[PDB]
Structures are given as C-alpha cells and as structure tokens.
Design a protein around this ligand. Structure first.
Ligand SMILES: Cc1cccc2c(C#N)c(C(=O)NC3CCN(C(C)C)CC3)n(Cc3cc(-c4ccc(Cl)s4)on3)c12
Ligand SMILES: [Ca+2]
Lengths: 234, 52
C-alpha cells in the first residue's frame, strides 16, 4: 500500500496472501471462513500454480504464526472479462481448514441491503496488503493497511478514463498520495461498524497508484453477496 | 431519520425494518443477545474482530 501504517499484531487478521511456485506474494485475499478465501479474478491469471498464506506480516522473517494452505478449488465468476475487469471476483476453497489465532481471523460478510445503506455510507474503509509502496516501486514485505475514504459514484465514473461498471466503486484520495497498488489486488477492503469489520470490497485496479485525479477501484462486494454464499455452499 | 435509519435502530449489527418495528441480527459467529440488539460472539474468533 502507498502510505498508511503497517498492520500491528492482530490488526489485519482477515488478510490472506497468494504465493506462486516460487513462494512469492503476487496478490491479496480475504479470509471468509476457515475453508474459504475471497479474491480478485484477474489475480487468477497472475500465476500458473499458487498457494495461500495467512497470518503473515513480514514476508522475510517467520513469526511462527504463518500457515500455508493449498488451494483445492478455484471458483471464478464466469462473467468476468479481462476486457473491462467487470465481475472481478473469485472465491478459493482450501484443501485444509484454517485455524483462527492471533493474526488469523475471518472478516464478516454483511447483508447487501444493510451493507449498501449502513457500511457503504460510512466515512471511510480500510484496504491492506503487501503491495508496492510506490506506483513504480517494489513489493512490500510488511503487511500494510490504509484508511481510504469512499468516493462518490459520479465523481468516480467521471474521474476514470475507464468504464466503472456497477461491480466497482472508488475509494481513496483525490490528490493525497495514499492509495493501494499492485500486489494488494484481490486484497481485502473492509468497513468497521461498532468495532466489527465487514468485507466491503476487493482491491481491483487503478489508473496507476495514488495518482492525482485517480482513485482506487474496488469490486463492490455487496453485489456478489449472493454469489459468494453459493460458491461456499459447494 | 427513523427506525433502522436512526442509529442502526440500536442493533450491534444487521438491522432491518418490517412493520413499524426493528429487528436485529448478527453474522454467523455471533448469536443475538438477550436485549435482541447486541451480538454475542459464539466462538473464540468471531469474524470482524481484530485479535487485540
Ligand atoms: C503498477 C502500475 C503502475 C503504473 C500504472 C498502472 C496501471 C494503469 N493504468 C495499472 C492498472 O491497474 N491498469 C488497469 C488494468 C485493467 N484495465 C481494465 C479496465 C481494462 C484498466 C487499467 N497498474 C497495476 C495495478 C494498479 C492496482 C491498483 C491501484 C489502486 C487499487 Cl485500489 S488497485 O493494482 N494493480 C499500474
Ligand atoms: Ca514471515
């Protein structure tokens, strides 16, 4: 992430990391439940074979808490399209169940009707990940998190040189140099409500990072609440 | 402002009007408290809670 602080012991439990053959974190993820991980569909094309790591805050220095789980099933959204990134979401089924502890916990999934009206109308939300700290910089090895204010839909669509479908939403800053970036993709965007956090988005893309006039484009998770439950049902 | 439109109708989590009256609910991992407004963590690690 560009700016923000590093996640302190326990702050970002629902954070998940996608590692390829060479055990590298290319994307992010959100812990839905012991057997389920939420992520962006576009990430699925970033690796030929990958696994998931959880409860990690320093890629280069094991904290004894990490845990690597093999992906058993990949449930992508058949309507996703690289051409527009519309329907940029995916759910992953783990071979083995996760074990919740200090930095390994799941984010809560809300109710579309409630979410859209309560959560989504909050002041800001929080995104996190081991993404690049600068647009053209390199991947971070410290799990990071940043508080991104919500952006008006109109302002959003308008500020983007790309088609902002209804499965997307802006979050981030107009000019301030704080915004997610590559590597946080598929990462978690959550919204606190009375000290409880709900998965509200999925790091998707942006016309660069932190750029003035450009925001962060996330996958509006409420639109797939129904789709996510079903993907879990089987 | 009115009902759930007012301070989430006093629910800890999910609120949803229905016949002039509020109804509270919680995500899975939490069980509705006596007052029917708060949400009690069932397991040790309910979702949405930082681990300190
Ligand atoms: C690394 C990086 C550096 C410099 C420029 C870009 C840049 C351009 N242009 C993008 C990017 O996404 N491009 C998209 C690809 C999908 N198309 C679709 C509509 C066809 C729109 C442009 N990334 C990579 C990047 C950017 C991010 C995020 C930034 C803020 C977030 Cl929230 S997520 O994550 N990875 C960039
Ligand atoms: Ca480590």
């Amino acid at each position: 992430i560009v700016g923000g602080q590093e996640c302190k012991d326990g702050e970002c439990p629902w954070q998940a990391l996608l590692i390829n053959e060479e055990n590298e974190g290319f994307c992010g993820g959100t812990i839905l439940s012991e057997f389920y991980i939420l992520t962006a569909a576009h990430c699925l094309y970033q690796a030929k074979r990958f696994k998931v790591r959880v409860g990690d805050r320093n890629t280069e220095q094991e904290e004894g808490g990490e845990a690597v789980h093999e992906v058993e099933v990949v449930i992508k959204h058949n309507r996703f399209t690289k051409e527009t990134y519309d329907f940029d979401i995916a759910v992953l089924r783990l071979k083995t169940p996760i074990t919740f502890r200090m930095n390994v916990a799941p984010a809560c999934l809300p109710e579309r009707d409630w979410a859209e009206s309560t959560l989504m109308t909050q002041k800001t939300g929080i995104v996190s990940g081991f993404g690049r700290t600068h647009e053209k910089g390199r991947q971070s090895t410290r799990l990071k998190m940043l508080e991104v204010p919500y952006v008006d839909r109109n302002s959003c669509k308008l500020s983007s040189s790309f088609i902002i479908t209804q499965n997307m939403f802006c979050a981030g800053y107009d000019t301030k140099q704080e915004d997610a970036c590559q590597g946080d993709s598929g990462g978690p965007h959550v919204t606190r409500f009375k000290d409880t956090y709900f998965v509200t988005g999925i790091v998707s893309w942006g016309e660069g990072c932190a750029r003035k006039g450009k925001y962060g484009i996330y996958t509006k998770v409420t639109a797939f609440l129904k789709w996510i439950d079903r993907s879990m049902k089987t | 402002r009115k009902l759930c439109s007012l301070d989430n109708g006093d629910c800890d989590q999910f609120c949803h009007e229905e016949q002039n009256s509020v109804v509270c609910s919680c995500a899975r991992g939490y069980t509705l408290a006596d007052n029917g407004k708060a949400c009690i963590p069932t397991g040790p690690y309910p979702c949405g809670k930082q681990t300190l």
